Amino acid sequence: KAKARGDFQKLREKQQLEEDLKGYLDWITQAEDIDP
Amino acid sequence: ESARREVESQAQQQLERAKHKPVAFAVRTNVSYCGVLDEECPVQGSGVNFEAKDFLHIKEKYSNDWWIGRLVKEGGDIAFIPSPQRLESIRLKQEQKARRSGNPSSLSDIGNRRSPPPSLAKQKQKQAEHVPPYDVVPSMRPVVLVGPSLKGYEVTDMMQKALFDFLKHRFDGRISITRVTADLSLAKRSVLNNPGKRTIIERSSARSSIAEVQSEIERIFELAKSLQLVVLDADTINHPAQLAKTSLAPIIVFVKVSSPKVLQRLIRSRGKSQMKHLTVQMMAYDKLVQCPPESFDVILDENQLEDACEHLAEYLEVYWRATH
Amino acid sequence: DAESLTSAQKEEEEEKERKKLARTAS
Incomplete structure (x- = not known):
């Protein structure tokens, strides 16, 4: 009865939003390290 | 008797000829039309049905009527591909195919006054977007x-x-x-x-x-x-x-x-x-x-x-x- | 919740990765 409201979606969307951050940041982080 | 077989076979061994010769400025086919229906293209040019996308290259400057293509693939199959000027010409001839299309009032025009298409609805116009159908470009x-x-x-x-x-x-x-x-x-x-x-x-x-x-x-x-x-x-x-x-x-x-x-x-x-x-x-x-x-x-x-x-x-x- | 999240998130792992051939083998 509580899965119909979509409360599971918020946690479901939280994992991917957190997962797709570290690789985005470290890619940005190491890009600065290669120097122009 | 085959006078073309002495030439087309020579032409066939002239199209790719030395193969290792680098291909020249690209000539990209863009209009799709049957290349197998009517047998043409000097060397008999049995190239597959033309289309867009395929990025071909011309190096055989034999005649302006038909060119040579180099599609992006290992080997680069060589076929007599129509010219940028001639590709819009091969699409031209099919304009009257469907019951003398164009200006004519073809509706029940069997009798008295008849209407054939004049030289006004063909490629004599469309200058604003007048673009060569083939795109000349270069390498990779x-x-x-x-x-x-x-x-x-x-x-x-x-x-x-x-x-x-x-x-x-x-x-x-x-x-x-x-x-x-x-x-x-x-x-x-x-x-x-x-x-x-x-x-x-x-x-x-x-x-x-x-x-x-x-x-x-x-x-x-x-x-x-x-x-x-x-x-x-x-x-x-x-x-x-x-x-x-x-x-x-x-x-x-x-x-x-x-x-x-x-x-x-x-x-x-x-x-x-x-x-x-x-x-x-x-x-x-x-x-x-x-x-x-x-x-x-x-x-x-x-x-x-x-x-x-x-x-x-x-x-x-x-x-x-x-x-x- | 954890079991359903795993079975619904690791499921798309194949449908996303394995499609590496889908763009190529086509």
Whole structure:
């Protein structure tokens, strides 16, 4: 009865939003390290 | 008796001839029509049904009527492919196929006054969009790179360098880098009839930004003929269109942020000061993908530069094995 | 919740990765 409201979606969307951050940041982080 | 067999077999061993001879300026077929139905093309030219996409190259300057093609693939099958002027001519003859089409009032016109089509509905017109059906271009269509951002902005300055990064040490010999910054947003195939050549007649064109933004392909020929693509970053390479039909047909790789939620979540990487671009940064996605983008064949899309490495590298390597 | 999240998130792992051939083998 509580899965119909979509409360599971918020946690479901939280994992991917957190997962797709570290690789985005470290890619940005190491890009600065290669120097122009 | 076969007088052609002495010539066409000589022509057949003349088309590719020495094979190892480098193919010349490309001639890209764009109109689809049956090449097997009617037997033609000097050498009997049994080429497959013509179409767009296939990026062919001409080097056999035998006759203007039909040319030679080099489709991007290992071997580059050689067939007598119609000329840019002649391809629109082979499509011409089918205009009256369906009951004498055109100006004629064909409705129950069997009797007394008849109506054949005059020489007015054919290619005698349509000058505004008068474009050569074939696209002459050069070596290994360079691949263009577009992601949702403003080029020259925080996230780009670091990351936009890292898109090739490995490619500098990984993909060379086959590929090279020629970093240029210009405004390729004025001409696509043919718009201006008085292009850059004089700044002495007080023309408004010379007063505007022409010349350097015009002859990008002309100077890049020295590297385009070197069988190596172009890697560039400027202030105009930001979205589809314009470049989608510019002087170089694009292969687009998408450095996308995937979810718009992480677009704004990443947009503050080092604290704040997005003040150069905040709004235009969120619609930086919206100006390219909300409407059907119909592009970005190679979506460099993952939370990994290493997996985006394989996503980018796999396509180019196979696409470059073709010119071997 | 954890079991359903795993069975619904690791499921798309194949449908996203394995499609590496989908663009190529086509």
